[PDB]
Design a protein around this ligand. Structure first.
Ligand SMILES: [Cl-]
Lengths: 398, 394
C-alpha cells in the first residue's frame, strides 16, 4: 500500500544525509527537521498497536526517571566524562542504590545513559543537558511539575466546566488541577519562589529561539527615522527583557535605542530598571496593560511576540484593536507567534494542548487573519523561520 | 561512524519496503532491529530540545486519546471513509474547535489521518481505541491509574524517604489517590469493573508464552500413573485457568481434572460462572498456607513481581512447605538482565508504584533460598525476557 513508499523515501533521505555527514557538509535546518519528522513517522508505521502503547508507557517512565534524577542531582553527581559506580553515585546523593540503579536502568534502556559493565554508569550526549539546572533542564522541571498534572485533570475539568475550549485567566485547567480554580496561574506561582524561578528560567529559554533581527528587513524604518527625528521607532509590546530591542538597534544603528519603547507589566519593568546599567543608552521603559489603549501613538513598528497565543480570539481582537487605534497609516505590526499548518506538526500540536491548560492556543494563518481583520488590520506578509513554524506576521491598518 | 548507522537503518527500510508491498511478514529479528535503530537514529539526530518535545508529546497524545475515547469520538467516526470535523462535533455534541485541536494531536502522531482541510478518518492505529478490548483498556488504565502515580513520585519520596518503595501499605498509588492508608486492591475494589478494567487490560501486557511448549511435562504424566490420588499441577494465582487447559491439552495422560486452579474466592467465583473437563477450583489466599499438599508441580505466574522480596519469601515458603521431595515449582516471571530491556525496565518502575519490582536471576535466587528452595534450571523465552524458573526443595 502507501505505507511501503513512505519507508522508501525516508531510506533515500537517510542515504543523502549519510553521504552528507561523510563529507562534513552542513545541513540546512529544513533538511534537519524533515529527517526528524521522517524518522518519527516511520516509527509509528512500523510499530504495531501494542508496541505504540508500550512506547508511550516508556516515555512516561522515562520522564519520571529524568525528573527524579534531576531533583536528586544524580546527573550532577555523575562526571561529565568517565564512569562511576552506582554505589558511588548513591553515596554522593545519599540515596538507596536500588532506587538509583532501577531509575538509571530506565535511562540506560532508552539510551539517555550508558551503563558500563555490571555496575558503572556514565553520561552520554543526551544526558549532559540535564547535568545541571539550566534553561533546558528547567523546561523539563516545569513541564513535569506545572503542566502534566493539568493534562491528567482534563477529563474531570471538561466534565466540570463543559467540553469547550478553555479560555480566560480564572478556572484554568492548571488551577483546577491545583485544587484552586478561583486562583489565576500567576497567583499560584507567586506563592512559591522556587516554582516561579524555574518557570522564569524555562520561559527565558524559548524567548531566545527565533530572533527577529536579521530575518526582518528594517531598512525602510531607517528612512522613517530620518524624516521624523522625533517619532517613536520600535515599540515592543510585552517585550519582557528588552533583549529584542537591543538586537534590532545594534544591527540597524540608524534606529537609536532611546527612540524605541519597551512595554510590559509594571512588575516586569521594575526588574528591567533594577538590573540595567543606568549609565548606558536604554529604550523608554513603560509600564502598561494589554487591555488598555496603546500609549505610544504613531510609532513606525509595533512588536507583540509570544503574547496573543495566551488569549482567546475575542481578547486578541481587543489587544490588536488598541494597537490599530494607536498606529499610523504607515505603521506596521509584527505578530511573533507559531503559525500552525493544517494539519499542524507534532511540536506545535503538543504546544497547543499545553497552552489549553492555561487558557491559550496556537492558531493557523486563517485564525490569525480573522482576528486581525476584526481588529481593523490586514495581513501584509508572513516571515516564517527556518526549521519551524514560528513566524512574524506583518500586519497593517485596513 | 555516525554515517553508516544511517545507511544500515536505510538498508533496513529498503528491506521493509518491498515486503509490506507484497504483504510479507518480514523475519521478527529484522522487525526488532528496525524498531531499534529507528529509536537510535532518533536519539542521534534529535536535538536536546526536540527530544524533550517528543517526551512531552507522549503525555499530550495519551491525553487526546483518553478524551476522544471518553467523549465517544472514535465511535462517531465512520468505519471506512472520511468525515468532517463539523460532523464529528455535531454527532458528539462538542465544540468543533476542541474536537479539531485534540484530533490534530492524533493526526500529527499518525493515529488518525486528515484528508484535505477538514476531514478525518480512522487508521489501523486508531481502531483499537474505538472499542472495549485489552489494548484500549490498558491505555485507559495507564492514564487513569499509572500516570497519577508517576507524577506523584517526586512528592512521595519527599514524604516517605528516597528509598525503594516496598509492601502493600503506603504505596505510591495509594499516595497519589489521597488515601495512603489504603492498600492497592482496596482501591481497585472501589468499583467492581474498575477491577474489571484492570483484568481486561492485563491482556495487553499479556505477551503470552504458552509454557506447554517450553517445559517438558512428560515426567509428570509418569508420576500420574504411579500415584493415582496425587495432585498433579497446582496453578497458584492462575486466575483464568488458561494455562492449565493449555498444558493438559498439549500433554497426554495429564488430565485436567487432577489439577487445581487456585486464586482469590471472588476470582474463583467468576471462573465458575463463566466455565463449565475442568480442574479443581479452590478459593485461596497465597499469603496463607497451601491446602493442596504434595502436588507434582506448583505454578506461580506473574504474581511475584507485584510484591517485595520478603513477601515473596513468605508466598514461596508456603509452597515449599507443601511440596514433596520430588515436587517442582515453576515461577513464571520476567527475569531481568543487567542492564534490562526497554519493556522490562518500564514495567519495573510501574511495579514500584504498587510496592513490587522486576528481579534478576540473582535476586530470584536470594528469595528462593530464603523459602527453602533452590533454582534447578531456567526455561527462557526466545525474543523476550519471560522465563520459567524450575525450583525444588533445598
Ligand atoms: Cl534491583
Amino acid at each position: 500500500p502507501a505505507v511501503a513508499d513512505q519507508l522508501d523515501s525516508l531510506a533515500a533521505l537517510l542515504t543523502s544525509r549519510a553521504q552528507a555527514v561523510r563529507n562534513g557538509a552542513a545541513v540546512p535546518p529544513q533538511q534537519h527537521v524533515q529527517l526528524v519528522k521522517g524518522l518519527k513517522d516511520a516509527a509509528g508505521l512500523v510499530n504495531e498497536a501494542r508496541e505504540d502503547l508500550g512506547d508511550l508507557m516508556m516515555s512516561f517512565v522515562q520522564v519520571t526517571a529524568l525528573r527524579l534524577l534531576i531533583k536528586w542531582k544524580v546527573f550532577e553527581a555523575i562526571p561529565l566524562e568517565g564512569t562511576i559506580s552506582y554505589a558511588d553515585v548513591a553515596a554522593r546523593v545519599g540515596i538507596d542504590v536500588n532506587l538509583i540503579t532501577r531509575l538509571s536502568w530506565v535511562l540506560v534502556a532508552t539510551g539517555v545513559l550508558k551503563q558500563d559493565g555490571s555496575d558503572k554508569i556514565q553520561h552520554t550526549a543526551r544526558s549532559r543537558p540535564y547535568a545541571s539546572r539550566n534553561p533546558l533542564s528547567a523546561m523539563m522541571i516545569i513541564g513535569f511539575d506545572e503542566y502534566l498534572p493539568a493534562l491528567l485533570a482534563m477529563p474531570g475539568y471538561f466534565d466540570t466546566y463543559g467540553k469547550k475550549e478553555p479560555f480566560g485567566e480564572k478556572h484554568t485547567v492548571k488551577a483546577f488541577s491545583e485544587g484552586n480554580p478561583e486562583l489565576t496561574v500567576n497567583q499560584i506561582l507567586a506563592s512559591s519562589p522556587e516554582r516561579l524561578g524555574n518557570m522564569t528560567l524555562a520561559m527565558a529559554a524559548m524567548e531566545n529561539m527565533y530572533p527577529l533581527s536579521g530575518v526582518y528587513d528594517f531598512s525602510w524604518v531607517a528612512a522613517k527615522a530620518a524624516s521624523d527625528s522625533n517619532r517613536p521607532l520600535i515599540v515592543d509590546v510585552g517585550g519582557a527583557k528588552g533583549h529584542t530591542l537591543q538586537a534590532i538597534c545594534k544591527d540597524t544603528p540608524a534606529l537609536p535605542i532611546e527612540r524605541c519603547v519597551l512595554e510590559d507589566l509594571p512588575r516586569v519593568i521594575q526588574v528591567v530598571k533594577d538590573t540595567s546599567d543606568a549609565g548606558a543608552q536604554a529604550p523608554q521603559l513603560l509600564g502598561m496593560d494589554f487591555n488598555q489603549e496603546q500609549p505610544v501613538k504613531g510609532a513606525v513598528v509595533y512588536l507583540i511576540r509570544r503574547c496573543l497565543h495566551d488569549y482567546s480570539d475575542e481578547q486578541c481582537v481587543r489587544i490588536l484593536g488598541h494597537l490599530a487605534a494607536a498606529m499610523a497609516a504607515d505603521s506596521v505590526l509584527l505578530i511573533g507567534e507559531t503559525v500552525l499548518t493544517n494539519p499542524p506538526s507534532r511540536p506545535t500540536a503538543m504546544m497547543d494542548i499545553l497552552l489549553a491548560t492555561i487558557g491559550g492556543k496556537e492558531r493557523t494563518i486563517d485564525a490569525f487573519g480573522a482576528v486581525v481583520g476584526r481588529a481593523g488590520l490586514r495581513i501584509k506578509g508572513v516571515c516564517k523561520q527556518e526549521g519551524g513554524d514560528f513566524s512574524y506576521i506583518e500586519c497593517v491598518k485596513a
